[PDB]
Symmetry: C3
Subunit: 113 residues, 3 copies
C-alpha cells in the first residue's frame, strides 16, 4: 500500500498524477469493464476529491478509462476502470494507463444520507 503522495507528476504543468497497473493487462472487447489494481490508496488532501481519467495516448490505442471519482476520505485502493474498445488491448505492468486529477471539494448544505 502506497499513498497518493508517492505518485509522480510527469511535469510541473501536468494536471494529473500518473497511475499504472500492478499486473500485466490483457483486455478484450467482450470482457466489459475491468477494475485494474494500482496498489495506491486514498485518502486525498483535505477539501479535495479525485478524478481518475485515461491518458490520451492510451485512449487512442483503444483502451478506454471510465471516469472514476475518489472521495476525499476513501482509504481503499484506487483502481482504474478500463475497457478494450474495439480490439484486444495489452498493457505491460508499469506502463502509465490513467491519471489522478485533484479537484476542490465544494461544500454545500445538502443532507448526508
Amino acid at each position: 500500500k502506497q499513498p497518493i503522495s508517492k505518485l509522480t507528476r510527469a511535469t510541473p504543468g501536468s494536471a494529473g498524477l500518473d497511475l499504472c497497473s500492478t499486473s500485466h493487462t490483457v483486455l478484450t472487447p467482450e470482457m466489459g469493464p475491468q477494475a485494474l489494481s494500482t496498489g495506491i490508496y486514498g485518502p486525498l488532501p483535505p477539501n479535495t476529491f479525485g478524478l481518475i481519467l485515461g491518458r490520451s495516448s492510451i485512449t487512442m490505442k483503444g483502451l478506454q478509462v471510465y471516469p472514476g471519482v475518489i472521495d476525499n476520505d476513501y482509504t481503499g485502493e484506487i483502481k482504474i476502470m478500463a475497457k478494450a474498445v474495439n480490439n484486444i488491448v495489452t498493457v505491460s505492468q508499469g506502463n502509465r494507463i490513467a491519471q489522478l486529477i485533484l479537484l476542490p471539494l465544494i461544500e454545500t448544505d445538502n443532507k448526508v444520507q
Copy 2:
C-alpha cells in the same frame, strides 16, 4: 421538479450528490445513448457548474454514464446519459446511477456567442 438542494450526499467526504432515475431502466447495447430522467432540475449555486458522472459500482456492472456538463444557469431537468456497454443492463427505479459533482466556474475573457 425538485432542485439540487434536495439531493443527498452519501457521506460528508463524498464528492458527488446521488442521482437516480425516476423510472425502471432496461438498456441494451444496440440502443445507444439514452437520457434517463431524474426529476431534478438546475440551476446550480453561483460560480459553479455541474459534472455528471457514473458511480463506480454501476460502471462495473456495464452501465456507462457519459460525462454530462451542467451549466450554472440551466433550469431544465438534469438527465443521465447512459449506455449498456456489453450486456443488457437493468436498473430499478430509485437505485443510484450517477452523481453530480459541483466544480468552480472559472471566469475568462472569452467572448459570449
Copy 3:
C-alpha cells in the same frame, strides 16, 4: 493556430468553451478512437488545466468524446478524441462537437518525473 482566447462561450453561464473540428467528420464504430483536429492550441491560463468533454446533444447522437486532459503548459493542438458508438456518425465542419472546461490546478508536493 489560434489560442484558446479565441474560443467562444455559448452563454455567460456556460461551463465550457465550444470546440469544432476543422474538417468534415465521418466516423464508423469499427474505426475506434479518432483524434479530431481543432486548429486551437494551448497553453492555458496560469494555475489551470483543461478538460475536454462532449456536448450532450452530440453524445446523444451517438458520438462519444473521451475525456481529454490538457496540461497547463501544453502548446500543441487541442484535439477531440471521438468515437462513433453504434452507428455511422457524420459531423459537418464547424458544428460544435466538444467543450473545453478550465479547472484549477491544485499544487501538491508530489515529485516531478
